[PDB]
Design a protein around this ligand. Structure first.
Ligand SMILES: [Mg+2]
Ligand SMILES: [Mg+2]
Ligand SMILES: [Mg+2]
Ligand SMILES: [Mg+2]
Ligand SMILES: [Mg+2]
Ligand SMILES: [Mg+2]
Ligand SMILES: [Mg+2]
Ligand SMILES: [Mg+2]
Ligand SMILES: [Mg+2]
Ligand SMILES: [Mg+2]
Ligand SMILES: [Mg+2]
Ligand SMILES: [Mg+2]
Ligand SMILES: [Mg+2]
Ligand SMILES: [Mg+2]
Ligand SMILES: [Mg+2]
Ligand SMILES: [Mg+2]
Ligand SMILES: [Mg+2]
Ligand SMILES: [Mg+2]
Ligand SMILES: [Mg+2]
Ligand SMILES: [Mg+2]
Ligand SMILES: [Mg+2]
Ligand SMILES: [Mg+2]
Ligand SMILES: [Mg+2]
Ligand SMILES: [Mg+2]
Ligand SMILES: [Mg+2]
Ligand SMILES: [Mg+2]
Ligand SMILES: [Mg+2]
Ligand SMILES: [Mg+2]
Ligand SMILES: [Mg+2]
Ligand SMILES: [Mg+2]
Ligand SMILES: [Mg+2]
Ligand SMILES: [Mg+2]
Ligand SMILES: [Mg+2]
Ligand SMILES: [Mg+2]
Ligand SMILES: [Zn+2]
Lengths: 74, 96, 55, 106
RNA sequence: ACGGAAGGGCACCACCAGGAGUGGAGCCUGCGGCUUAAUUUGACCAACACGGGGAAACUCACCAGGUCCAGACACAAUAAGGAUUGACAGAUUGAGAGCUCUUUCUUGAUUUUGUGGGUGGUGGUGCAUGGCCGUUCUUAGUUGGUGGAGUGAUUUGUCUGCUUAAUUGCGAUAACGAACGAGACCUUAACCUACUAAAUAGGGUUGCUGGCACUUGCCGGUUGACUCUUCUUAGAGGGACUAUCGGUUUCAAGCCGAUGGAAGUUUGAGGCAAUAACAGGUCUGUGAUGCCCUUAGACGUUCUGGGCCGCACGCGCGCUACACUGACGGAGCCAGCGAGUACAACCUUGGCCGAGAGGUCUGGGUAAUCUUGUGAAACUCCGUCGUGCUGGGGAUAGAGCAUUGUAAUUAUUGCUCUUCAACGAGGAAUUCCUAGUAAGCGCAAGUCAUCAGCUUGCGUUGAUUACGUCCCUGCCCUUUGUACACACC
């Protein structure tokens, strides 16, 4: 018993926050020492365990396996 | 849904072991009974199974009673890669 | 749908805290003796429940 | 040796009556053919359980209202009785509908 | 069908005799209107304290906004050099939302985006529908089989009379026998010194104790002992069928009167309740449901907040009153239906404290055990007030203390103080009612966390006036007239 008006929006748009398709982040993560030992880059996660690389933003290195656990200054 | 695969396979395993499941309607609840998962993706996984035709669902008083078909048993066994001889406890004929 | 914001509001009590258990309705609900079912659902199933018209 | 008097106490329950009445008749007949001391099948006020509802699902129409009910009868009994014969009596002659409960009065 | 046509009967949703009122007042509550972003909506005798609709969050339906996908499955397409997801911190956001962004990390084939396809919907359509109940219609009316009458539409049976509440019977009969409805039937209320029994109900005797009178009498207490079942329970049953009698009646159907009785209105009150039908209401109860609409910045779902409760006005249920049959103090001190804590958290006794609401600590109770003998109100008795809008009336108004609640502001509710308004028995009209009745009086239950003025039921104090009639409003059937048949709107 009612006809509905069209939902007109005074709101430009909000789009899905697209994830960034990173091309070969592991070369960014690692560093090869000429066919032998290999080093990692920028930290390793102590709260999560070995092998999980951390986040570089600024004045703080950040987790993301257990994201909220580790974001500490260094 | 986007089920963490382990959760899905343990759901399927429990379904195989019992042979049937109810999974009360109540949405948005944290912990599904006796399986330690969320009722939501339990319901959605069983819907996916039914759309495949492996499972027959009888819905009475908001409860989603589920039944396994033999081909559903076969496909579930393939997914959970158990030996072909095993059967759900429903097939173990309870004779009283 | 934040896990702590989706369905955030409490439902310990009030109208919506309980469901019909037959239709899931909120309106016209009966809570006496734990029936938790609505008016008319009771109206027909009561005979199988054990209820009968007497007076 | 289980000779200690048990003061066993039974309590029945039934939506209906005749099943409860014949169950009580069977219990007393068993006790008396077993030579037991009994406090008779006492009669308790049958609790009426009433619900008044609106007939119409929508409220339209002249106000018309109905009253469904049950009438529950309890009628407990009690014996000054030994164990094995009496516990066997408790576990026999039950028909559907009538619910029986036993307390040992320990 | 209708008739301001006739006839014979009915009904306190009609009247008579009246009782109580409503309509005047303030409050509450629901409609309309207005307003608003939204005041979400559906009913207009049978809508309006209805949708159990007593909405602070939800309920949710509307509004301002933010999330998320609860888009199965098929295919294609990308794509493991990552489909994608999630994300601290900040900007931004009401937010401590990785909503969006800055960055960086984390995650791995469940996904993502296109095509179908399907779900979801308090979206629409009760004039597509089922179910449901309401109403026609609390009255007594329906229907078929042969049979007769008619060419047939149909009719007779279903009726001239009398009788009943009844199409209930006596009967008369082109009708005969049959079915439904009414009754019969079931629940409840009453009566059972008859039976069966009972520390989860009572009583007597008798112990042990308290007080008094002292004569051995009373009133008390007491999980002591014995015994009993009238009272209380609930099973079996008994009891009334108009019994007996007197009237009246083509003496039949029955109606009236008295006695006996518990009960002599169908014993009272109920529950089910026929055919046919309504464009009655309900998609807003449903995972009852067709069709149509929408299905990703959504009409899905969720989160925050607003409203549904706003105000120039009118209308319907109700509440408190207008005081002396009163108000306020004391004192007396009687019920009956209920309900009550579990996977949680109710009923709460008692002892505390506080003026109060209240909180407090231990209790009992999953229930004839405890709340409980729900020690309720009106009422009863003794006082104060004294005809004064007064100590009537208690709305509207400030402040405080608490309580439920995540959240009481737009005052949830309670209590304390103060303010004391409108109101002088209420126009035309109109409602309900004939015995445990109306009216007054509360209590329990639904809603409930907190909320009632509502509502179901319960009991208490308990009447005036009929025990009749078609005059108004309708109803039954018969006869009659009609240009009506969507039927006198
Ligand atoms: Mg009059
Ligand atoms: Mg009045
Ligand atoms: Mg008035
Ligand atoms: Mg409005
Ligand atoms: Mg009527
Ligand atoms: Mg409220
Ligand atoms: Mg709201
Ligand atoms: Mg909301
Ligand atoms: Mg919005
Ligand atoms: Mg729904
Ligand atoms: Mg209709
Ligand atoms: Mg014929
Ligand atoms: Mg005829
Ligand atoms: Mg009858
Ligand atoms: Mg007796
Ligand atoms: Mg005579
Ligand atoms: Mg009657
Ligand atoms: Mg009828
Ligand atoms: Mg629909
Ligand atoms: Mg919605
Ligand atoms: Mg409203
Ligand atoms: Mg007025
Ligand atoms: Mg009304
Ligand atoms: Mg006063
Ligand atoms: Mg007084
Ligand atoms: Mg009593
Ligand atoms: Mg009192
Ligand atoms: Mg005054
Ligand atoms: Mg009064
Ligand atoms: Mg109400
Ligand atoms: Mg009369
Ligand atoms: Mg009238
Ligand atoms: Mg015509
Ligand atoms: Mg005219
Ligand atoms: Zn870490």
């Amino acid at each position: 018993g009612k006809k509905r008006k069209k939902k007109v929006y005074t709101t430009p748009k909000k789009i899905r926050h697209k994830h960034k398709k990173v091309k070969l982040a592991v070369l960014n993560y690692y560093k090869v020492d000429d066919e032998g030992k290999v080093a990692k880059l920028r930290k390793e996660c102590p709260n999560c365990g070995p092998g999980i690389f951390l986040a570089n933003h600024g004045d703080r290195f950040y987790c993301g396996k257990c994201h909220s656990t580790f974001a500490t200054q260094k | 849904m986007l089920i963490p695969k382990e959760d899905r396979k343990k759901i399927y395993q429990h379904l195989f072991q019992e042979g049937v499941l109810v999974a009360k309607k109540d949405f948005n609840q944290p912990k599904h009974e006796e399986i330690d998962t969320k009722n939501l993706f339990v319901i959605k996984a069983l819907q996916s199974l039914t759309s495949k035709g492996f499972v027959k669902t009888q819905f009475s008083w908001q409860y989603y009673y589920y039944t396994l078909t033999e081909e559903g048993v076969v496909y579930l066994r393939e997914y959970l890669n158990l030996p072909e001889h095993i059967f759900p406890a429903t097939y173990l004929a309870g004779q009283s | 749908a934040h896990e702590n914001v989706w369905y955030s509001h409490p439902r310990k009590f009030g109208k919506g805290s309980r469901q019909c258990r037959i239709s899931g309705s909120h309106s016209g609900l009966i809570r006496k003796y734990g029936l938790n079912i609505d008016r008319q659902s009771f109206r027909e199933k009561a005979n199988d429940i054990g209820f009968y018209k007497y007076r | 040796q289980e000779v200690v008097i048990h003061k066993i106490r039974i309590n029945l329950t039934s939506t209906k009556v005749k099943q409860l009445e014949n169950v009580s008749a069977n219990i007393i007949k068993n006790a008396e053919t077993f030579k037991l001391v009994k406090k008779g099948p006492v009669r308790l006020p049958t609790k009426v359980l009433k619900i008044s509802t609106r007939k119409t699902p929508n409220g339209e129409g002249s106000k018309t209202w109905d009253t469904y009910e049950m009438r529950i009868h309890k009628r407990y009994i009690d014996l000054e009785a030994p164990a094995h014969i009496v516990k066997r009596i408790t576990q026999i002659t039950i028909e559907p509908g009538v619910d029986v409960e036993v307390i040992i009065a320990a």
